[PDB]
Amino acid sequence: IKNPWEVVRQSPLDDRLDKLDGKIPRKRGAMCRHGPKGMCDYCTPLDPFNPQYLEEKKIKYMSVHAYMRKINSATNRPELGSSFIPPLVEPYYRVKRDCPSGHPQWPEGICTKCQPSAITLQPQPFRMVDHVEFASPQIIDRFLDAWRRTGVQRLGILYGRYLEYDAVPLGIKAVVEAIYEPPQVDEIDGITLNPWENEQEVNQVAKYCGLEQVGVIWTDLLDAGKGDGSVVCKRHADSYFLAAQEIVFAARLQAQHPKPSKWSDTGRFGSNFVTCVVSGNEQGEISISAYQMSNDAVEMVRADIIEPSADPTLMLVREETRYIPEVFYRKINEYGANVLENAKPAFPVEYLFVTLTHGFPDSPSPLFTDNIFPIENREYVGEAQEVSAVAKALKVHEADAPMNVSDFHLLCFIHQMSVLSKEEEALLCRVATLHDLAESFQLRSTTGWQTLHMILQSTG
């Protein structure tokens, strides 16, 4: 039957991004030997993957689409349908199953036709998302209220959508709207989760709101003890950037969130799921470092290969079911040479992440404008989820007052109340995200929101 890339379906953004070359058109350059409708070696339009263009624009890696249009010819294109080669290959560092050479499975049998290859941890030449647009500082300033009251760290989940980021060519931006937090037992240097219980529920809110789990955020905010918000400069050049337990644990969640792709052999490639670490700069102000594991770093967690050390910069190679061949990493020495060092038993963790930029809009107009809810799983600071706030939050005993539901924490609490049905809550999350007046007037005339009135006109 068909290919996966003949049955999988891209995102609408991936539908938007395919119809563009992303080519950067030069005008008549230096060594033009032509009239103005001629060309020379120096007035061609440019590439999205052009390294001199990425160097002058200080752009670290090309986008995954700029990677896509680099590695593939234009003719090899899925609108052919049947005759299409997916240029992307999701890594398969597990074990060649169903081996066609007479020997048993991987277990009990091995030959050359079933073994995977030894890993060359180069830097990944591309990344998925380039910019991390936090849609409001009030998204953050709400979120960092737990740390200012306690001082211990905080984990969250990035919600939102992926849009075009036009500053870099073919840039995808992680527009961030919302954060939900599962039950968890919080400590200082590490965090261990409790299992998340309403897994279909909060995901249904994003399905209502038109959001999804677009990534993960957590914090590394250790106040440096001078009372301003300065940190111990701990995530920088000399120390490290990513804790290696954070790398594996995010790659656990990143394996839980791949992205379907019409350009890859499984019909899926990479991951929409991204990673952010809130920290502090050298200047003593609350900064953010955004990353994502490489497609090897996902696979070596999927194929159970690497392991953290006591040194956060060193990553251990696991000793011996499975198959652990060489790992390398290409270097640049002090005269530019590329030396693949033996990564057994340990190696730098540099070759596993990609760097991302991060920021804000010029003026905050997110899909959420309201902030009225005490955050879940904080009964250790007395910040709980009770029904009694809705008399002041949605203002239902003050029955004239308009709709303050523009709050994802509260929208999940309304979804925790689970009163509005699947069409009326998608009429709520219609009005909770778009705020139409005649549709608020429709929702204030719907039965279930008037049921949500008349139930909460009789509470205390």
Of positions 2, 26, 57, 113, contacts Zn ion by CB under 5 A: 113
- Return d(Cα 162, Cα 160) in angstroms, integer: 7
- Return d(Cα 369, Cα 184) in angstroms, integer: 28
Is 29 a binding residue for another protein by CB under 8 A? The answer is: no
With contacts defined by CB under 8 A, name the span among 67-75, 164-172, 249-257, 391-399 that binds another protein. 67-75
Question: Choosing among another protein, Zn ion, none, which partner's interface includes residue 47 (Cβ < 5 to 8 Å by kind)?
Answer: another protein
Question: Six-digit token pair at 457?
Answer: 């006109």
For residue 44, the minimal CB distance to another protein (Å) is: 5
- Let me know: does 261 contact 18? Beta carbons within 8 Å: no
Is 381 a binding residue for Zn ion by CB under 5 A? The answer is: no
- Return d(Cα 369, Cα 226) in angstroms, integer: 34
Give the x/- contact pattern for another protein in 339-358, rule: CB under 8 A. -x------------------
DSSP class of 358: E
Own/partner pairs, 358-363, CB within 8 angstroms, 24+ separation: 358/131, 358/132, 358/133, 358/134, 358/276, 358/288, 358/290, 359/131, 359/132, 359/133, 359/134, 360/133, 360/134, 360/135, 360/136, 360/137, 361/133, 361/135, 361/136
Q: Which is nearer to another protein, 122 or 369 (CB)?
A: 122
Is 44 a binding residue for another protein by CB under 8 A? The answer is: yes
- With both helix axes pointing from N to C terminus, report the angle between 408-417 and 199-209 in degrees, rounded to the nearest 10: 120
Of positions 323, 378, 419, 450, contacts another protein by CB under 8 A: 323
Of positions 18, 265, 304, 307, contacts another protein by CB under 8 A: 265
Is 209 known to sit in a ligand binding site? Answer: no
Is 117 a binding residue for another protein by CB under 8 A? The answer is: yes
- Return d(Cα 310, Cα 334) in angstroms, integer: 28
**Which residues have C-beta within 8 Å of that of residue 90, sequence separation ≥ 6?**
264, 265, 266, 268, 269, 270, 295
Give the x/- contact pattern for Zn ion in 3-32, rule: CB under 5 A. -----------------------------x
Residues in contact with another protein, total (CB under 8 A)?
37
Question: Six-digit token pair at 23?
Answer: 């080519």
Q: Which is nearer to Zn ion, 58 or 97 (CB)?
A: 97
- Let me know: does 281 contact 287? Beta carbons within 8 Å: yes
- 146, amino acid identity: A
With contacts defined by CB under 8 A, name the span among 98-106, 366-374, 380-388, 397-405 that binds another protein. 98-106
- Return d(Cα 303, Cα 91) in angstroms, integer: 10
Question: Six-digit token pair at 294?
Answer: 């490489």
Is 37 a binding residue for another protein by CB under 8 A? The answer is: yes
Is 7 a binding residue for another protein by CB under 8 A? The answer is: no
Is 82 a binding residue for another protein by CB under 8 A? The answer is: yes
* DSSP one-letter string for 91-139: ---S---S-SSSS-SSSS---GGGPPPPEE-PPPSEES--EEEBS-HHH
Q: Which is nearer to another protein, 35 or 460 (CB)?
A: 35
Is 40 a binding residue for another protein by CB under 8 A? The answer is: yes
Residues numbered 409-438 forming contacts with another protein, rule: CB under 8 A:
none
Residues numbered 29-68 forming contacts with Zn ion, rule: CB under 5 A:
32, 40, 43
Question: Choosing among Zn ion, another protein, none, which partner's interface includes residue 99 (Cβ < 5 to 8 Å by kind)?
Answer: Zn ion
- Let me know: does 339 contact 330? Beta carbons within 8 Å: yes
| Torsion region of 51: left, alpha or beta (phi above 0 gives left; psi -120 to 50 gives alpha) | alpha
Is 318 a binding residue for Zn ion by CB under 5 A? The answer is: no
In sign, the C-alpha dihedral spanning 67, 69, 75, 81 is: positive
Is 100 a binding residue for another protein by CB under 8 A? The answer is: yes
For residue 68, the minimal CB distance to another protein (Å) is: 14
With contacts defined by CB under 8 A, name the span among 56-64, 70-78, 354-362, 443-451 that binds another protein. 70-78
Q: Which is nearer to another protein, 252 or 318 (CB)?
A: 318
> Is the N-terminal amide bond of 345 cis, ω within 30° of 0?
yes
For residue 324, the minimal CB distance to Zn ion (Å) is: 17
Is 27 a binding residue for another protein by CB under 8 A? The answer is: no
> Nearest Cα to 300, choosing from 325, 273, 275?
325
Please calculate the CA angle 60-66-68 and round it to the nearest 5 degrees. 130
**Which residues carry a binding-site annotation for Zn(2+)?**
32, 34, 40, 43, 99, 103, 111, 114
Site of interaction with Zn ion (CB under 5 A): 32, 40, 43, 99, 101, 111, 113-114
The site for another protein (CB under 8 A) is made up of 3, 33-35, 37-41, 44-45, 47, 71, 74-75, 82, 85-86, 89, 100-103, 110-113, 115, 117-118, 120, 265, 323, 325-326, 328, 340
As annotated, the binding site includes 32, 34, 40, 43, 99, 103, 111, 114
